[PDB]
Design a protein around this nucleic acid. Structure first.
Lengths: 86, 130, 136, 82, 156, 200
RNA sequence: CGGUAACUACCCAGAAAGGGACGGCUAACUACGUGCCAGCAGCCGCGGUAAUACGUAGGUCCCGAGCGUUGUCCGGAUUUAUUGGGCGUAAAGCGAGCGCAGGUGGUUUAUUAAGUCUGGUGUAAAAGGCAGUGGCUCAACCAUUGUAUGCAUUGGAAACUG
RNA sequence: UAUUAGCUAGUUGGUGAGGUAAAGGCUCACCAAGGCGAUGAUACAUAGCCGACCUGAGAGGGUGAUCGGCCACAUUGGGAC
């Protein structure tokens, strides 16, 4: 029911994602709930805003991260924290 | 009519000082005693006295002049008309005449002065400037 | 100015008149009282340049075109400049313009238009009345 | 259950419903003085204990039926007819 | 001798019996940019004659506003018929924000900035009188320390 | 763009330090009204006169000027005129022009605009690059051997305040910023600000 | 989007500035056919013999890859004047009385805190301002980061009103 | 827009039943007659609304473009799985 995705926000050749917890129904550019963090992969480089708290709230509720969002959580150790709750 | 002895009284002070004469009049309240009290303390009149047994006791008041009966009070007015009990905030109570004017406001504590009304975060009814 | 009077009272106004009564131009579907999305022009038609008598004491003679208006209004608007090439069944642009010396007008005509030629190097803009920057 | 209003009824005749006057002084942005305004709320009567002068109080609950939005349950103010 | 500004030559007439006598009038403002401003009027036939009369009248009614450091004492007003000029001290030194017939006034008085539109009329012969009145309404801080009867620490 | 200066040179008699050269004889606007007489101005005429001397003396455009001049009308710290005329030096051709190397600001704007002088790793195509103090200005040796620069710009000269003048490498570093204490033509916020910025 | 912006070898000053405006009204007038003629114009207007009005060249006045024109709207306009009107004559006091609502309230004792001021609570996902950061360079603006808010509900204040 | 006066018949209460995810004339049956409204109810024109945004020093005026939210719609009208 609940997801976590990016946000396309940028130029013709300088995009800028912004991670927002979402749904299957949620417009990825329009209607939202609340964004968590602002992201830019390859400039300059591996740039991210992280708080690692509301992802734990919406994983207590259960969400779905994206590609680089999920891999960002493997780059955040909270999946190893799911080994810890495990 | 009787429904504004406040601006009736301040208007009467403008009769006394603009007519450059000695004594103005006011029936007995507590609020007018605070008017001549606070403004006598700020140096604008020279008496605090009323008729000793009357609920309409004439607060007859000698004024505080300049040097030849010269005026001190010029822009005397009641701010809050009887048709409008003026209810302002407490935090940005504004300056008067860029500081050159009085201010008197019935705050939740009492009826206090300009900067005491400003920075004590007390607020109430705006009454009168000069 | 009592309590109820100064509450009944709005900030009302009554003088509200834009100078262009305009059905410009337009979107001719079936009914055409479509209003208002006004142009500074008309992609419409007019018929004939007539001659207008000016005011006192303006001894002159000025050229108004018999303006077709589908909205029941003036068969006139002013043709600026010396001379004109148009005739009946010609699309006529519509300047929003007024001259006190020209009676019975509301509008002018855009001379210096798609249907207009002239002589350039004019001391005002070189290019109105049907002209350009001179290609020699 | 939650909220509250107050005022005299217009019609103390109906069954399981009765209205209320409202005093609420709310602002005119030009004039500044907060002005009285009388909203009306026809709702519950317990035993149709209707009297001129009294004031019943609302309940934010299930509406009774059509037009009966609160449940005017508790008569907190009780006056006497003249 | 004062620092000079010329407002306008006026347009007035004398109507003689068998015709129309060309009457001539003018109005200048003078002063030495310190708070002292005068104004003159020429009721004559020609331009330097109205300069003569312009200093005959400009030499008097030239008084001093209590200039509290190129500023105003506080917000004042001038009313004389249709001259209705409310003058406002504000942030100063960053642009002489005035009307045409009063920008010369705070030039010849030396105020850094003002905030002065006008209401009523832009009639200059009431603008100058409302300008004199707008200087006239001013009590000052040495009087509120002094004439009020107590050295009040809003200025101290 | 690149217009003459019969206005600066003739309608004021002074082409100030956007060029700097006092012009020679016949200070009227010539052709017609050259042998003829003078004219007058008003407060509009010196709003006019001051905006054209400070604007059109330099090489500034009015689009960039009034847009970045409202951007000089940003803050409300009392007299904003320090923030106005302080942003007269922060264009790079004025910085080299106050290094004294280029004859005019138009020369440093030319041969700095060409991408000759590579100011810290960028092929410079804006000589109105907004200058921050305490930074160096890297100058390419190819530019240092341009024969127009070797004729005039590398042909060294005196130097103003507020920078550091590397005569060997023809460089500079903005030490402080010039101001009303430093530069003084008849700069008036009433004239230029009350000619442009909501005329007031 | 791709040999993509960037970079070297940079070619010749050679390939690459025009538009509006000049009676004032606000800065820019003399050759100038005219002759109230043709025309110009937002207002005052003009042109009837040398018109800085116009056609007209030169000089100029402001701008720019945009100029100017009207079409709309805001301001000035306080021209509905809460801020920020007037009513004797210039527009205006009913043709005068009542006593319906409605409005306003002599003084004072105390309560009340309703309104009034203070604290907690809601507030635009945002985007947007006041600042800062980086950046398509620096530009402009974008990306970011905070700041700034009856959005609300709840303790206190009896100084005013109720 | 009161040169937009009297308006309202399931109208408004009560009971029952059907429905619904649910109190609820939500419907429907029956029995009661109210109620609204001259401090604007109905009828007519007009309108997608809001955050926002252009202008005005602000007060504000003005717009709802593009962006985001809600609402509504799917040649037209109406049903229903």
């Amino acid at each position: 029911s609940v997801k976590i995705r990016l946000t396309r926000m940028g130029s013709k050749k300088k995009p800028f994602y912004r991670i927002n917890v979402a749904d299957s129904r949620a417009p990825r550019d329009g209607k939202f709930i609340e964004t968590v963090g602002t992201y830019n992969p390859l400039v300059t480089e591996n740039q991210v805003t992280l708080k690692e708290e509301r992802v734990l709230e919406w994983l207590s509720n259960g969400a779905q991260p994206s590609d680089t969002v999920r891999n960002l959580l493997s780059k955040a150790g909270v999946m190893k924290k799911f080994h810890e709750s495990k | 009519v009787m429904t504004d002895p406040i601006a009736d009284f301040l208007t009467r002070i403008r009769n006394g000082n603009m007519r450059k004469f000695d004594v103005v009049e006011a029936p007995a309240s507590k609020i007018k005693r605070q008017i001549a009290e606070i403004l006598k303390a700020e140096g604008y009149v020279k008496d605090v006295e009323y008729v000793e047994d009357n609920k309409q006791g004439v607060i007859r008041v000698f004024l505080k002049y300049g040097k030849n009966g010269e005026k001190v009070i010029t822009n005397l007015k009641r701010i809050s008309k009887p048709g409008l009990r003026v209810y302002v905030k407490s935090d940005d109570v504004p300056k008067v005449l860029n500081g050159l004017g009085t201010a008197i406001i019935s705050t939740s504590t009492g009826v206090v002065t300009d900067k005491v009304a400003r920075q004590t975060n007390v607020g109430g009814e705006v009454i009168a400037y000069i | 100015p009592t309590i109820n009077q100064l509450v009944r009272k709005p900030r009302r106004a009554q003088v509200t008149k834009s100078k262009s009564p305009a059905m410009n131009v337009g979107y001719n579907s079936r009914k055409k009282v479509q209003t208002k999305l006004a142009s500074p022009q008309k992609r419409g038609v007019a018929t004939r340049v007539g001659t207008m008598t000016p005011k006192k004491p303006n001894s002159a003679l000025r050229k108004f075109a018999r303006v077709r208006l589908s909205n029941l209004m003036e068969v006139t608007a002013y043709i600026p400049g010396i001379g004109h090439n148009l005739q009946e069944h010609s699309v006529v642009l519509l300047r929003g313009g007024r001259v006190k010396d020209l009676p019975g007008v509301r509008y002018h005509i855009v001379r210096g238009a798609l249907d207009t030629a002239g002589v350039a190097d004019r001391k005002q803009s070189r290019s109105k009345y049907g002209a350009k920057k001179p290609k020699a | 259950q939650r909220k509250v209003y107050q005022g005299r009824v217009v019609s103390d005749k109906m069954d399981k419903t009765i209205t209320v006057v409202v005093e609420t002084k709310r602002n005119h942005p030009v004039y500044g003085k907060r002005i009285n305004y009388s909203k009306k709320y026809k709702a519950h009567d317990e035993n149709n204990s209707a009297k001129t002068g009294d004031i019943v109080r609302i309940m934010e609950t299930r509406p009774l039926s059509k037009d009966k939005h609160f449940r005017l349950v508790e008569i907190v103010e009780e006056a006497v007819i003249i | 001798e004062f620092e000079e500004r010329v407002v306008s030559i006026n347009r007035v007439t004398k109507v003689v019996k068998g015709g129309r006598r060309l009457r001539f009038a003018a109005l200048v403002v003078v002063g030495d940019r310190n708070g002292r401003v005068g104004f003159g009027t020429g009721k004559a036939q020609e331009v330097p004659e109205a300069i003569r009369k312009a200093i005959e009248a400009a030499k008097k009614n030239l008084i001093t506003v209590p200039m509290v450091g190129t500023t105003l004492p506080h917000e004042a007003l001038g009313v004389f018929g249709g001259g209705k000029i409310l003058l406002k001290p504000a942030v100063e030194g960053a642009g002489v924000a005035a009307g045409g017939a009063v920008r010369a006034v705070l030039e010849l008085a030396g105020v850094a900035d003002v905030t002065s539109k006008s209401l009523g009329s832009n009639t200059p012969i009431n603008v100058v009188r409302a300008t004199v009145d707008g200087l006239t309404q001013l009590k000052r801080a040495e009087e509120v320390a002094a004439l009020r009867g107590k050295s009040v620490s809003d200025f101290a | 763009y690149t217009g003459p200066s019969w206005k600066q040179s003739r309608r004021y008699g002074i082409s100030l330090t956007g060029s700097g050269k006092e012009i020679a004889r016949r200070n009227y606007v010539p052709g017609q009204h050259g042998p003829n007489n003078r004219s007058k101005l008003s407060e509009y005429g010196l709003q006019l006169a001051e905006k054209q001397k400070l604007r059109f003396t330099y090489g500034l455009s009015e689009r960039q000027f009034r847009n970045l001049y409202v951007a000089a009308t940003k803050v409300k710290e009392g007299t904003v005129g320090y923030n106005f005329m302080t942003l007269l030096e922060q264009r790079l051709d004025n910085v080299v022009y106050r290094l004294g190397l280029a004859t005019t600001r138009r020369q440093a704007r030319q041969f700095v605009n060409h991408g000759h002088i590579l100011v810290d790793g960028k092929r410079v195509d804006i000589p109105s690059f907004r200058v921050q103090p305490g930074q160096v200005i890297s100058v390419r040796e190819k530019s240092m051997k341009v024969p127009a620069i070797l004729e005039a710009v590398e042909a060294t000269k005196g130097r103003a305040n507020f920078v550091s003048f590397d005569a060997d490498k023809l460089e500079g570093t903005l030490v402080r910023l010039p101001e009303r204490d430093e530069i003084n033509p008849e700069i008036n916020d009433a004239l230029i600000v009350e000619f442009y910025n909501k005329m007031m």
